[PDB]
Ligand binder design. Structure first.
Ligand SMILES: Nc1ncnc2c1ncn2[C@@H]1O[C@H](COP(=O)(O)OP(=O)(O)O)[C@@H](O)[C@H]1O
Lengths: 134, 197, 334, 342, 350, 67
């Protein structure tokens, strides 16, 4: 298992004929946009996100990594993928493999935070209603 | 010579063949031999176009894209094409069992993992099969390798290479693994990470 | 009795009505705020102020393009950090800077990932030790006996800080990845050369005081790296504090006392309002029917009036400190 | 199996925090769902019924109605959908996950301008729809999968208190004394009727099954698929109507009362038909059972609740995907749900 | 009667709230007991199955195995009763009485003592003695006294953890996460023999009981084996294989035989497409199921499939149960029950 | 929870040890064949080992449950 194929030791491990001529080289690379889309669709499936009005944003096909946007979840997934791409582009990490660690961690954190804050919202509204009624 | 042997194995342990299925198998093995080393998307697209052109030139079939050819021996007795949905469901169930028995990892199942697990299984069903996985961190290399080795009943060996260690310990670990492979007939998948060099 | 109590509670009635009317906007902006907060925790740990500003601009542009509303006045601290956390963190020795406060909340809310703290001054060692008070173990990757002491800390559940994190030893890899065996009713981890029970209260921190060091890929991709470095406003605050304590200590003491007492008053008043609403909620009947509830709400209103009166009276002196602060901005700038 | 009447005493009593506003029986498991007046939804196991399996605060005002459907997809796993409408002008749609005993929110439907009073959910092929009506006098249709409205129409001058769905038709019972049949996918009104003295509380189709009012009397109604419906109002009376046949959208023609059932002392709050028997409840603290063939009261449950009975649940007997279990559930103002098993 | 094979379709379909972990038929009444993955135990009538007769949340984690025994005390002036024994991932075994006059699960007691999940539990009765044996992921096999409620015997037959046990007379045969069976004499706790030949962990192992009739593998081949009481056993593994083994004969506590310490695989059955999850022998037929949405009826005389129920479940088939044709106290009814991953069980009758 | 032993049968010592350890009510039949191997129970000469009470019977020490 090699993570950085441009490192000196990894370059020696790759170019050395003793390993090259015997092993099957399987280029894992990194996640493409479709894999990120599928992972996000799985993660945010359980978040109660559809509790507001949503208007389908008019965007070009090249800006959509999912099926055509219909729900809030599609927009959120596209936003997250775009932000990760822009983060790596602007941070200028060269041609390093795009590790999906940040994307995964952000997805988990977003799930937890949305759950907690929606719970707080609903409870506060209920208490306010009860007070006014009393 | 790898392609030859691949085709042989697929035909030898497979079901009754049709010309269409035989050609699709040939394309699958072409993907495994030549294209898995390609890096960029353009090269993979060019290879797919090359497959279409070669088939039209010599073997005048359906879609033979990289994700349209899922040949597997996991879901059946012979080596044949499988439905994507069935393979995903089977992998998910076996992965839950693997988490329960070996190690809990709350990972999401997607299509790319299925392609990669199938090719890793292909490689680990070969005689003297060895593979070197190159890709970003936290993409599922080590855990996927462990899961495949568990499916095929291999003992997983991960050398405990750490600071304040040297070639004596690495030699001892390799010697132990070798001795267990030979004298105990222990089928072994030895995982060497680049950080251990 | 009833008329007097409802007349007194008319203020809370008005505030409650405004809150429920703002409910629609509050619900509309929730998803955007959650996206901003999650991204802020995930990506901004190792960025400076300018970089965070740029990334927030980019993220707001993406939110605009994809029709997701958000609080235009969003602030990370105000959205996620509460008064209790602020007060306790400052009492532990945290700097008053916004940057340090943001870094403190991000690193404290790293529930799943081992936090990696870069602090050239080793201030955060002191802050964390004061926060946990005791049962805190200081190990190092650069010393002998590391493995055994870490094993014991795991087994008993102490809060461990490992110094000199740039010398990370992969022998503890299974802790960083949190790859535990859920052995029936126990949770264990394989470290060193054997299996060790995880108490479940164990927490791990890694610390380095060598900026631009060398963090290997394995650790780098699996930790939440947060930078704790000084900036303009921290330097200016420390310079002014030195100037004021040297020149005029009495205003220093009065300023600190006023700030602390007003913050405590605000916290008390907030919790009192919360108690008022909770008590009115769980009435088990009409307010007239429940005389104890009427007395309780009257007493709560009296306490609220007292607290607010104290805060309002104490606040009257602060502009003196504002002018005294403006006196030394020359030294600050230079 | 259908020829079954509950006993005089419930098998199980379930207490909740406050007044029960709606109850629905899990279509395949011994689970009862209870929606209360404080915006909360409970799931109870009938064999372990003291502490609820799940407790959800879904809404901020009272729940007015709910409905349940177990999906039948032809390709994609099936699951139970729960649709809950409240006074908050919102309809929340949940998935029941029996593996974790939790309510997983799927989405919410917005668009009504006042209290939503009734909902109905049904499936065609692999398409699932949600219909509802509210005090704004509007009846709206949402596509389940898409999450936004599909159709809108207004059948009455007064606001609709309840609706029902069969095929592609809806009878809506108004806050007025009148009831109206409209064609669902066009909004074209087809028939109107009156006869009640006070606002209608319930209305529902009568489905044909292998009985006096549950078979087509002509081949025309056999081809149409329906001939009779039943409604009840605050005039203490239950009325069974013949449905006129349109110009086979269909082009219009009045409802004809074919049998009138009386006996309650107060407002009729629920209608439920199981085989040969009509079960109903009123605001007189009693449940009662009439014979559908002869129009007489066969059995009376007096003092089943110390308050008024708000809702009943009995299994569908006109669906091949529903097992007509011998189990009936009642719930009412007094914070009680009475479950009659066997 | 023993010639009966189930029809191609279930006689009835029984629905439960989640995955079925095990099923057992009530030995005398038309009642089926079903244990699921959430720690719940259920009793269903087989003529009115649309509403459970009873249910009980006893454990807190998944039930891993259930066994049932109807007692027969010899003129001890005691009322005989069905004892239902369940074991779970909670490191516990629970023992219940079935109260047929109330149709409820009345807990009799609980047995503690394991350090990990229990993978099998069995109950059997001697002249006026009831015992409960279990094996678990802690690698130990422990036998408790039913009446006294505390451990009688402990032994460790494998270096890996034990997955399946069966008991015949005074012997226990145990399959493990390793690929080797072991036969041990339980009263003295002395291992006697081992059977190697599998490639993957063992899912089930069961004795093959003699039938008073002729059947290929249900009759002794010598006077020594006849007097011993056992000739063959059957096991199934995750290598898609079911093996019929010839048991070696120790010198008759029994003495391990220095030259006959190994099992001899006499027949191998292949045809399943996945892990074999259960096995059961009725008459001349071996019924088994796999993680391939299918059940198979095998002819024990030739080692071939006779009939196959394909796509019987929409998920993995987890458990089978048939009656006992080698016990005078059990009527070999025309009944089969299958239960599986899809939150369903199928009951075949008549 | 009543155990019937005898001085005139085999396996006496082990079953009595278990009954002691778990606290069952034991009746030993055929008392005229009393075996002095259980002498320390008749005299109730127990070792009060800190928080436990034990008795030496047969050839080793056995915990007394107290019931
Ligand atoms: N398909 C995936 N879905 C979710 N998380 C993943 C996936 N692949 C990798 N991960 C994340 O990466 C880690 C597992 O990958 P791992 O085998 O450790 O990669 P490597 O060891 O090669 O860096 C976990 O932290 C996991 O959360």
């Amino acid at each position: 298992t090699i993570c950085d194929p441009t490192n000196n030791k990894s370059s020696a491990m790759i170019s050395s004929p003793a390993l090259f001529n015997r092993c099957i080289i399987n280029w894992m690379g990194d996640w493409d946009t479709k894999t990120m889309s599928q992972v996000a669709n799985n993660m945010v499936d359980v978040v109660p996100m559809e509790f507001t009005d949503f208007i389908v944003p008019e965007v070009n096909k090249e800006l959509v990594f999912t099926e055509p946007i219909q729900t809030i979840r599609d927009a959120v997934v596209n936003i997250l993928i775009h932000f990760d791409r822009n983060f790596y582009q602007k941070m200028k990490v060269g041609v390093n493999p795009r590790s999906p660690g940040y994307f995964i961690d952000g997805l988990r954190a977003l799930v937890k935070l949305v759950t907690a804050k929606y719970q707080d919202l609903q409870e506060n509204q209920r208490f306010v209603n009860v007070g006014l009624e009393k | 010579t790898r392609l030859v042997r691949g085709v042989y194995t697929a035909i030898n342990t497979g079901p009754r063949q049709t010309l269409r299925s035989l050609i699709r198998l040939w394309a699958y093995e072409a993907w495994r031999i030549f294209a898995d080393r390609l890096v960029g998307v353009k090269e993979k697209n060019s290879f797919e176009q090359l497959l279409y052109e070669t088939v039209d030139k010599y073997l005048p079939l359906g879609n033979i894209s990289s994700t349209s050819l899922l040949f597997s021996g996991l879901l059946s007795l012979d080596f044949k094409e499988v439905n994507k949905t069935d393979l995903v469901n089977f992998i998910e169930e076996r992965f839950k069992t693997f988490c329960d028995e070996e190690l809990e990892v709350p990972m999401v199942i997607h299509e790319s993992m299925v392609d990669h697990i199938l090719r890793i299984d292909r490689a680990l069903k070969q005689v003297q099969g060895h593979m070197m996985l190159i890709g970003a961190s936290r993409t599922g290399k080590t855990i996927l390798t462990r899961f495949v080795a568990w499916l095929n009943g291999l003992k997983i060996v991960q050398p405990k290479i750490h600071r304040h260690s040297n070639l004596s310990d690495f030699d001892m670990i390799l010697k132990k693994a070798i001795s267990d492979c030979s004298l105990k007939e222990s089928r072994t998948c030895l995982i060497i990470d680049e950080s251990n060099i | 009795r009833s008329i007097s109590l409802v007349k007194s509670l008319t203020f809370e009635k008005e505030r409650w009505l405004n809150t429920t009317k703002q409910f629609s906007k509050t619900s509309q902006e929730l998803i955007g705020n959650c996206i901003i907060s999650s991204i802020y925790e995930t990506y901004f740990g190792h960025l400076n102020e300018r970089e965070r500003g740029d990334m927030l601009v980019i993220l707001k542009r993406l939110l605009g393009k994809f029709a997701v509303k958000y609080d235009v006045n969003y602030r990370f601290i105000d959205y996620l950090v509460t008064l209790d956390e602020k007060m306790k963190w400052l009492e532990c020795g945290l700097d008053k800077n916004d940057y340090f406060l943001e870094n403190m909340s991000i690193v404290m809310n790293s529930q799943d990932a081992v936090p990696f703290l870069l602090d050239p001054s080793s201030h955060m060692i002191t802050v964390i030790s004061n926060y946990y008070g005791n049962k805190t173990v200081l190990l190092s990757f650069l010393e002998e006996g590391f493995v055994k002491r870490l094993e014991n800390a795991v087994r008993f559940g102490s809060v461990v800080i490992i110094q000199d994190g740039e010398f990370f030893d992969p022998i503890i890899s299974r802790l960083i990845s949190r790859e535990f065996n859920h052995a029936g009713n126990r949770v264990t981890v394989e470290i060193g050369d054997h299996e060790v029970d995880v108490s479940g209260d164990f927490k791990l921190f890694i610390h380095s005081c060598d900026p631009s060091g060398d963090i290997p890929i394995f650790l780098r991709s699996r930790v939440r790296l947060v930078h704790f470095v000084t900036n303009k406003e921290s330097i200016e605050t420390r310079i002014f504090d030195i100037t004021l304590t040297e020149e005029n200590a009495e205003m220093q003491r009065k300023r600190e006392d006023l700030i602390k007492l007003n913050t405590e008053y605000r916290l008390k008043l907030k919790n009192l309002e919360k108690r008022l609403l909770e008590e009115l909620n769980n009435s088990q009947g009409n307010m007239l029917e429940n005389d104890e509830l009427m007395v309780t709400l009257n007493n709560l209103k009296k306490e609220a009036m007292n607290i607010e009166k104290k805060l309002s009276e104490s606040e009257e002196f602060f502009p003196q400190f504002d002018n005294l602060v403006e006196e030394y901005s020359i030294i600050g700038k230079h | 199996v259908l020829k079954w009447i509950p006993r005089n005493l419930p098998s199980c009593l379930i207490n909740v925090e406050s007044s029960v506003t709606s109850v629905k029986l899990h279509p395949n498991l011994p689970i009862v769902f209870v929606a209360t007046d404080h915006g909360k939804l409970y799931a109870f196991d009938l064999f372990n019924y003291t502490i609820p399996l799940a407790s959800l605060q879904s809404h901020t005002k009272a729940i007015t109605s709910m409905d349940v459907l177990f999906t039948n997809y032809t390709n994609k796993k099936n699951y139970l959908v729960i649709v809950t409408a409240s006074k908050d002008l919102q309809i929340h749609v949940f998935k029941w996950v029996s593996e974790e005993c939790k309510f997983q929110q799927i989405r919410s439907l917005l668009g009504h301008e006042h209290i939503v009073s009734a909902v109905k959910i049904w499936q065609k092929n692999n398409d699932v729809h949600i219909a509802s009506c509210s005090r704004d006098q509007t009846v709206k249709i949402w596509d389940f999968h898409n999450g936004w409205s599909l159709k809108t129409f207004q059948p009455h001058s007064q606001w609709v208190r309840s609706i029902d769905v069969l095929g592609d038709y809806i009878i809506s019972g108004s806050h007025d004394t009148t009831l109206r049949l409209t064609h669902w996918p066009s909004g074209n009104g087809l028939s109107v009727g009156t006869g009640h003295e006070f606002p209608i509380e319930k209305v529902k189709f009568i489905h044909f099954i292998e009985i006096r009012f549950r078979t087509p009397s002509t081949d025309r109604y056999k081809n149409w698929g329906m001939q009779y419906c039943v409604s009840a109002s605050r005039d203490r009376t239950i009325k069974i109507w013949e449905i006129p046949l349109p110009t086979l959208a269909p082009i219009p023609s009045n409802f004809r009362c074919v049998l009138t059932l009386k006996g309650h002392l107060s407002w009729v709050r629920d209608i439920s038909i199981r085989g040969q028997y009509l079960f109903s409840c009123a605001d007189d603290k009693s449940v009662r059972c009439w014979d559908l063939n002869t129009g007489q009261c066969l059995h009376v449950w007096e003092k089943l609740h110390t308050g008024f009975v708000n809702c009943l649940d009995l299994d569908v007997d006109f669906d091949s995907n529903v097992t007509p279990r011998q189990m009936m559930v009642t719930g009412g103002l007094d914070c009680k749900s009475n479950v009659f098993m066997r």
